[PDB]
Symmetry: C3
């Protein structure tokens, strides 16, 4: 259809494929296994810890609002199903805790369904974390840090995202070029 | 197994909450209104009948990083939904809409919400003819949806939020030991 | 009775509205497009074919409490094999502004309504940030959309149709509240 759009996308593809400074895929930290949820931009870091199942979830999708936004959702599940969820953002290489809540069953915490989110929306989301004592919140940070949820992992998530966004952008340019053919 | 420093900090925090003498007390609702939570949630419904109509003032007791939804159902099924904000003890009408049946209106759940987002949400209440706006507010105040109710909802949600926070520390404590 | 004064109030407003001679006229859609309402809703699809492609421009005549100035549209371009581009644009000052471009392997994945359909899309790659794209590429996308009838004339239609449809729903709303008060 549009020769001009095919040319613009072709050149961009050529610019990207020829770069000598594309983001390098980072190496995950010790103990964690990266598992992309099939077909999506969602990834689950996982590992066991003293009988607990740990999951660190994050999307490589970019938010058109806060471009520097790098949110993560960490789930810590006990043998009886009791799960803690901690929401953190990665801001200037540091982890910032934004929410802490609990669920009776692991499945309801990690389910990606719309009806599951609606279930979770009804429950108690926890207190306003930015209004908690330094001692309590700092202990929660250390508790997470000892389990591997630390600044090195935040760095990995950010570097992995830059890398994945680059590959997806290349795929996006290819598809756009196909549409302009 | 777990982490003792967090067990102690949550324990210390629990001691401080249970030792307070300035904690919010559970207020009582205005006459007729039956307070009933949805099992295992922070959603609360104040229900009662009024001249054949089934009323429901719904609010959540969770905080965001005070709003109510008033459902008025006719015997036919016709349901009005009034979204109100509790500013300084007083009420501010923000939205008015309608549904053929009470199910679609009150139904929580993702799919029910999606259907609602597709339907006409109503005119902008602020642009409405002021004589009609008066009459709707009178219409609501007659059914007990007034500044006395907006007062309860506020005080009640403070109370429920203290309870959930205490259970949250108990849960987190149990979690770290 | 208070619910009797509401009846009189809605009845007076309906009479008022029904007797106006300055109400919004329903606009005429640009060439090729067909207007089709999603039954019972404020969602509308403008459909048309162009060089084997199935085009859909989707919008709602509902207005946001705060955003009573912007009009969002979702443009779908579906190929023969089902692969579908979605372009999100806003209409501001009679000007089309491009806010997002993304692709899907299948048409239903892109265009299905519902909570679950949205949630599935929420997990997929939504495309790059449009602000960070080069002028050349983004300008060529705008032209590409323009060739297909997605231009300022289409935007003006949507704006005009929203004003008209909003008046119609308000009138139905007055009747329904009046019924409620009767």
């Amino acid at each position: 259809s549009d020769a001009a759009l095919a040319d613009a996308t072709r050149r961009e593809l050529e610019e990207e494929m020829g770069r000598s400074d594309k983001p390098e895929q980072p190496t995950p930290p010790a103990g964690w296994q990266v598992v992309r949820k099939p077909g999506t931009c969602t990834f689950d870091l996982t590992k066991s810890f003293e009988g607990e199942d740990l999951v660190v979830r994050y999307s490589t999708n970019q938010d058109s609002d806060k471009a520097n936004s790098h949110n993560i959702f960490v789930y810590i599940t006990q043998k009886n199903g009791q799960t803690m969820q901690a929401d953190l953002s990665i801001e200037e290489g540091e982890l910032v805790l934004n929410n802490i809540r609990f669920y009776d069953e692991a499945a309801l915490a990690k389910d990606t369904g719309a009806e599951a989110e609606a279930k979770r929306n009804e429950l108690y989301t926890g207190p306003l974390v930015h209004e908690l004592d330094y001692d309590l919140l700092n202990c929660v940070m250390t508790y997470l840090e000892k389990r591997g949820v630390d600044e090195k992992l935040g760095e990995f998530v950010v570097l992995y995202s830059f890398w994945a966004e680059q590959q997806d952008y290349e795929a996006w340019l290819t598809t756009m070029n196909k549409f302009a053919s």
